[model samples]
Target: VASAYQRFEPRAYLRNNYAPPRGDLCNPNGVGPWKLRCLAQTFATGEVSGRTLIDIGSGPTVYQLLSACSHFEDITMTDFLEVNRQELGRWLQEEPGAFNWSMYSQHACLIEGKGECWQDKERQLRARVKRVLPIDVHQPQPLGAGSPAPLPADALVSAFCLEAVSPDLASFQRALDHITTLLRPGGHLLLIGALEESWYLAGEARLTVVPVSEEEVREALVRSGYKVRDLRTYIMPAHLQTGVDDVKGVFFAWAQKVG
Candidate 1:
């Protein structure tokens, strides 16, 4: 799992794989960065209106959380891995002063072997969100169940997670159970996941998988006490050079706590 993130080390293209700028939004073999930005934008419209939000499996960059912070007032970011949580914390504090657009321009030359600098874009985005708390999803109990951490939240978001690691439908169900527990009744859940295939790149190495289908994802949310409000799909374009395939497509879904 940690190996999947090495490519994001300062300057690298594997980072591009997770955040491609265009193509199918549903297929997850490789996602365009535009798709992620669009997803975050859509999420902001729905969740940022409120005061609280929680991002599960929030990886090291906290991209979604940071994006949400710019719009939302209260936000919590968490992951099951301690290393990732630490990295996220560090980046949140250090990234603002990390460099100027020139650095991002040089970055493309060093990593992607291209000459694209989207720093001004990132700077504009960073101005929207701010951090609220750091959490560990694998905790033996809830944050307040003898745990000295933050409180529960009003909205939740999970991206490109849950699906890849679930060994089976039952595991996916179990994962949603925890996610729903993090939300209050009437809170919204915005999730993005992959279907059909099990793992892909984190950095350079492949993240392992326990695959499922789009329908299975819907069922998991329903069983977890969330009502399917709206659901959509995006078919991401494939990159043969990167071994990208559509057998593993992306799924974007929204559910609300009805009970």
Candidate 2:
């Protein structure tokens, strides 16, 4: 809950959640497309765009921001683990074997009515991401207590972070509240995470997840100065259970930080 991240294996973690079966994009009925669709559909409305967008706990994956990258002029990616941050850097810098995100990029573009031009989409994402900063959701001043991303980012996206990192619901609430300060009032937040999941394995490390409910997520947002615009849930097909985690489902919520 506090510092289990030390045992976090970046590659192993990716293989579990970002690789086949679970991360398969061809299955439009799966979590991958569900999450991307949630973000893309919300972004297509064109209500969330702003000058700055920050991704919290990027977790060695950039698919969450594929559609969002085009909306903001400057984007920032952050995580509690330097290992994850470096993973993001590897892809951002186009280093060899940086976890191919082209399909995700392609899917994102295709959704927006753009031709199969994922090459340009991924390039834009790399160019728009201005910095990769560290973020500790448990801290009151997560990004800035030291050197932060530009304060009050216009919008924020955090996927499978709060509950996955926190040991209990209390910590989950606190973590959610802490990150809210990073967003400007009226700014939007696209939050995606496991539903009713207690723990998940990441290689040698088995991290605990605070099993959160759909109602609790919305309530937590309201408690942290947010107005829920839309909330959606997806039940993971029983056949796809990877045995890595007993995650029953995924929840995606679109909320705006209320003044």
Candidate 3:
């Protein structure tokens, strides 16, 4: 499993699945927009402001944080793989050949009803992100010792990570529990993931994913001591199905830890 992640190509994955126009994998009319909409609404309606927001299992993507940038003073990103971390670094440093996130930022801006200039949103996101640390979801301390960023995040955002990383339902629940430890009590947890997705392709490499249902997700959160504030699921339209994976739909949820 470890070696499989090393072969993952962050840039190719973005171009093929996240970029606009050709990347039907995340078209605005598809699950992508719905996921973004849910997140945008969640941040917009509540007192989401905090000292820190951590993106857990952030696989070289920043769309999840577009609406959150203004709410948090510090944003920290984490991934289990070093390559993904390096890919994020390349974008943060504005190095050549970094994945262009301006399109996604523009999409988010439209959903957020915030502004039109995607460049400004991109700059804000880039500026808010303070660190990219390594994480192991299966561990008791997913961030691990000697982590550069501070612990007990005020808010945690994750998308397509828990199920993609776990091998089974039991492990998935365990991973969620581990992640909750990173958040302070009464902190917020914003989750997004594929519903009933068994696998997905990251470049030429095929990766295994544990499928999950909406009920299972809600139950997991409640079992983990979180209050389910809002949840939404989006079914993929037939036109958007590329047949690359068996994902039936996507889900987004907002939960708050009990104080």
User: Per-prediction count of colliding residue pairs?
Assistant: 21, 0, 0
Highest TM-score, which number? 2
TM-score of 3: 0.94
Best by lDDT: 2
After superposition, the stretches of candidate 2 with alpha carbons farther than 4 Å from their true spots are 146-148
Tens digits of per-residue lDDT for model 1, 107-136:
322333224344533543344334534443
Which sections of candidate 1 miss by over 4 Å?
1-16, 19-30, 37-48, 95-150, 203-206, 244-247
lDDT string for model 2 (86-153, tens) is 99999999998799887778778877786749988888899999999988888898886656467789
Ranking by lDDT: 2, 3, 1
**Candidate 1, position 59, lDDT:** 62
Q: What's model 3's lDDT at 83?
A: 82
Whole-model lDDT, model 1: 0.55
TM-score each candidate. 0.69, 0.97, 0.94
Residue-level error in angstroms, candidate 1, position 69: 2.7
- Residues 1-259 of candidate 3: C-alpha lDDT, one tens digit per residue: 5566777878767765675433432556766677778888889886666888999999888888988888888999999988899889989889987877776687788888865588888888889899999899999889888777777889999999999988888899999999999899999999999899988778777778898999999999998899999888888777666746778888898999995
